[PDB]
Design a protein around this ligand. Structure first.
Ligand SMILES: [Mg+2]
Ligand SMILES: [Mg+2]
Ligand SMILES: [Mg+2]
Ligand SMILES: [Mg+2]
Ligand SMILES: [Mg+2]
Ligand SMILES: [Mg+2]
Ligand SMILES: [Mg+2]
Ligand SMILES: [Mg+2]
Ligand SMILES: [Mg+2]
Ligand SMILES: [Mg+2]
Ligand SMILES: [Mg+2]
Ligand SMILES: [Mg+2]
Lengths: 68, 150, 52, 261, 180
RNA sequence: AAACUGCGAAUGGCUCAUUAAAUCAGUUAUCGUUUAUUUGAUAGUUACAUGGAUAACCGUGGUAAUUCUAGAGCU
RNA sequence: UCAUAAUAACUUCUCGAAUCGCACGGCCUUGCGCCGGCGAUGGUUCAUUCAAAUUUCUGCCCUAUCAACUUUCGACGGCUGGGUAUUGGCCAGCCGUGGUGACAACGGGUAACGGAGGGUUAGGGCUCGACCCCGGAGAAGGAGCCUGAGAAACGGCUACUACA
């Protein structure tokens, strides 16, 4: 056929749009940019890998010099 | 029932929280208040037997002059064994329906109940029992009335 | 302690009580005019209330 | 099973929630509260599935975080809050109030109410006795406890609650000739007049009612909710709960259709 | 065989290596928490008395106060014990620890100075390490600087000057959040 | 950031080995008990503020080896 | 013998707030004086909710080449206590000799988790149901336990056997 049906949302203000409207549609429309992240498996690997360090896990190279 | 003596045991039998040795004597109509024998009524149109009010027996499982409340089902039956101490066995008969053959067959079950010294029960009699809290391994009912003999 | 040198800690702890008493009176006084200024500022709001 | 449950499977939810068997595997699982789990009206289902104000779950939970919706004059912020019979839900921004009441088919329906009448409730009393210190009190069906009540008030009656001060303005006795609505059983939505009551010693009595159209029905006392003697205090919904049979239901449906167009 | 010697007064610690056994003979058969004289250890230690604080075996297991044995024994360490940190409430794990009686088998001793001697140590008693921070409660501050009931304790508080990385502006001051 | 403290981790997901009045089903009772949480009521016999520890942290070690740990100095 | 009230006493013995965030206000004896709002987190008892554990009645396949079974060291009932969140032969002492069965007990088989239900049709039936819904049990095989309202838990611990 030649007819098409969809859904529409009309907002009072553009700021009200960004306050309640979901992000992925914003990416669809181009208003907002996409978020860059690593894959789900790599993120999962990192989180459990940091469970083996105790205190200030951000830098852990101080134990590399123990062997001399 | 037939009991020769009331105090024939190692310990002393008495109703709990019934004060019996007061210097001043006061006469009151209330059963338990004045210091004399205490008793209650179960309900459901069941009348307290006359022998209970003036009897001297001590029992903590009788629905009258006892600490047991009656709630649940009420059943009726025929006594088949009453030759042990303060407990009887009744026999109940019913009909089970087999759907395929469109006819019935007889079945039966055995039940254990506690009998108070107020009643006198002999073999082959109708009794009415009521549910109560677990009193033993296999005793959960108490006799309330003995129907007249044919 | 690292923040304060040994000379500082001894002198600070050993400040004379009479000097401390003067210090208290000095400290209280500026707060007292500042509180009076608080009533003067409240008068400033009172003037604003009169104006509108 | 090693503790209490916290998940509820779809296809096991109460029927009167009217949830589709497709589009997901789980259900809202209403949280604990003042109303029974079996017959309650979760706030998320009411806001999203009936009023159609919120499209899905994500903004549905946002709505309560903005504190826009309140029940009984007090704001609630949990999506699975158990609402129930006679409770009043108020949305000020749009400007209307709702009361949850069964329809004649046994499910909750939307019912506009006026603002002046939407500021009080009424509920059946469950137990009355004196508490600690000798102070008498009673508790109704919606977990409302009130101290120092009228001594003549007994159990199974109904009492009118102000909902702002919680004071006992008025009450209705439970006797023959009163107007009642059924709350449990297969007889969902019916309204009738008490004809006579028959009691059975040992529990589980039955009461006989009579409808305005000379219909007859009976129900347990635990399912009767008296709402007036005559001229019921609350405003009944459309149809007044008369339970027309299917023959006239189809006759009226075609009559109304032809009448409109 | 290493030695970890500490000076609590100066907040200074040092590590020494000892390979000659007859100097270490007088430590044998001593118990954890005891007092010993350091005179046989060397001439620079004359007038020193030391407290035995702990040690480690060659295998790496630590010494436990209260267990009398020269070998090592297995124990069911619960919560609150010394050499165990549980990972879950009420959890107990079986570990192996060495007794509190000193012997030739252990690899390193840890001990501290109790009384200062006439002689000085080249790398231990000549330096003092600053405490990182100071008191944080109002009562502690008052007791420390010996103030009275009303003396406006707010002014009297240690201040450490910190500066940003490279903004080029002047540094500012940071404060310890007086409690109570 | 790190760390103490609070809560959850006893829900979910998988399988059908054992089990013949046992499990289970419909129907009752708890006047015979425990109950986090949610909801509603409810408690008139130095004080302008009490006391010691501990984590994070600085710095020094042991074991080929683990989400192993010691003793010393702060809050 | 209920809810609740009163009296004489008792207790290694509880609770009755030394916690946190927003607002900037009002009095006269003008003191760095007094009073005052809304929330968060906690807290004794009652009520409610999600429940949980026990519990009444009736209902399960084939087999007699299974006809008598149960009580050594509880098998049936009575009493005094202990233990448990509570009842109870659940356990400890004393005293009676009971309980089930041809209306099929007891035992042996099951290529047996139970139910809602699937397949096949004149009607009556025969057969299947590990499997998306409800209930029960288990985490290689046995036992024991901490924390916690809730576990005899195994993506919790301890010990033995077999693998590794
Ligand atoms: Mg489960
Ligand atoms: Mg009842
Ligand atoms: Mg199988
Ligand atoms: Mg509360
Ligand atoms: Mg007993
Ligand atoms: Mg016989
Ligand atoms: Mg099997
Ligand atoms: Mg199945
Ligand atoms: Mg299990
Ligand atoms: Mg296990
Ligand atoms: Mg696993
Ligand atoms: Mg699991």
């Amino acid at each position: 056929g030649g007819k098409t049906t969809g859904f529409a949302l009309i907002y009072d203000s553009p700021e009200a749009l960004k306050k309640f409207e979901p992000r992925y549609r914003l990416v669809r429309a181009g208003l907002a940019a996409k978020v860059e992240k690593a894959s789900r498996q790599q993120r999962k690997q990192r989180k459990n890998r940091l469970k083996t360090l105790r205190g200030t896990a951000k830098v852990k190279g101080a134990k590399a010099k123990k062997e001399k | 029932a037939t009991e020769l003596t009331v105090q024939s045991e190692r310990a002393f039998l008495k109703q709990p929280h019934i004060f019996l040795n007061s210097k001043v004597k006061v006469k009151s109509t209330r059963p338990g208040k004045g210091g004399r024998r205490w008793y209650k009524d179960v309900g459901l149109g069941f009348k307290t037997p006359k022998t209970a009010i003036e009897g001297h027996y001590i029992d903590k499982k009788c629905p009258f002059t006892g600490m047991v409340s009656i709630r649940g089902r009420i059943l009726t039956g025929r006594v088949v064994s009453t030759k042990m101490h303060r407990t009887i066995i009744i026999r109940r008969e019913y009909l089970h329906y087999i759907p395929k053959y469109n006819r019935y067959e007889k079945r039966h079950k055995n039940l254990a109940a506690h009998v108070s010294p107020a009643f006198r029960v002999e073999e082959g009699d109708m009794v009415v029992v009521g549910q109560c809290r677990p009193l033993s391994k296999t005793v959960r009912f108490n006799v309330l009335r003995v129907l007249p003999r044919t | 302690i690292v923040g304060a040198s040994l000379e500082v800690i001894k002198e600070r702890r050993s400040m004379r009580p009479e000097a401390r008493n003067a210090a208290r009176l000095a400290a209280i006084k500026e707060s007292k005019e500042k509180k009076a200024a608080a009533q003067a500022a409240k008068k400033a709001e009172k003037a604003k209330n009169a104006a509108a | 099973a090693r503790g209490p449950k916290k998940h509820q499977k779809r296809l096991s939810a109460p029927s009167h929630w009217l949830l589709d068997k497709l589009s997901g595997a789980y259900a809202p699982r209403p949280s604990t509260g003042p109303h029974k789990l079996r017959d309650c009206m979760p706030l998320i289902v009411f806001v999203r599935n009936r009023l159609k104000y919120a499209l899905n779950y994500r903004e549905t939970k946002a709505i309560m975080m903005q504190r826009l919706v309140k029940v009984d004059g007090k704001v609630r912020t949990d999506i699975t809050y158990p609402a129930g019979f006679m409770d009043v839900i108020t949305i000020e921004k749009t400007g209307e109030n709702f009361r949850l009441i069964y329809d004649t088919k046994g499910r909750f329906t939307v019912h506009r109410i006026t603002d002046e009448e939407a500021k009080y409730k009424l509920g059946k009393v469950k137990r009355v006795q004196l508490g600690r210190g000798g102070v008498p009190f009673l508790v109704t069906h919606d977990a409302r406890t009130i101290r120092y009540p009228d001594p003549l008030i007994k159990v199974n009656d109904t009492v009118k609650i102000d909902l702002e001060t919680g004071k006992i303005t008025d009450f209705i006795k439970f006797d023959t000739g009163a107007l009642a609505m059924i709350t449990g059983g297969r007889n969902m939505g019916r309204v009738g007049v008490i004809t006579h009551r028959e009691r059975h010693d040992g529990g589980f009595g039955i009461v006989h009612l009579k409808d305005a159209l000379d219909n007859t029905f009976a129900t347990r006392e635990s399912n009767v909710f008296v709402i007036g003697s005559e001229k019921p205090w609350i405003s009944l919904p459309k149809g007044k709960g008369v339970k027309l049979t299917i023959a006239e239901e189809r006759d009226q449906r075609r009559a109304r259709a032809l009448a409109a167009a | 065989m290493k030695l970890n010697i500490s000076h609590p007064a100066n907040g200074s610690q040092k590590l020494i290596e000892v390979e000659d056994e007859r100097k270490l003979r007088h430590f044998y058969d001593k118990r954890m928490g005891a007092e010993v004289a350091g005179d046989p250890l060397g001439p620079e230690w004359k007038g020193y008395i030391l407290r035995i604080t702990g040690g480690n075996d060659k295998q790496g297991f630590p010494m436990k106060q209260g267990v009398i044995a020269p070998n090592r024994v297995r124990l069911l360490l619960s919560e609150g014990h010394s050499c165990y940190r549980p990972r879950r409430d009420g959890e107990r794990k079986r570990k192996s620890v060495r007794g509190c009686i000193v012997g030739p088998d252990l690899s390193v001793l840890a001990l501290s100075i109790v009384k200062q001697g006439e002689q000085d140590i080249p790398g231990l008693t000549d330096v003092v390490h600053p405490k990182r921070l100071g008191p944080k409660r109002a009562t502690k501050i008052r007791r420390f600087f010996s103030l009275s009931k009303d003396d406006d304790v707010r002014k009297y508080v240690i201040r450490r000057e910190v500066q940003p990385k490279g903004e080029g502006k002047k540094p500012y001051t940071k404060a310890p959040r007086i409690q109570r």
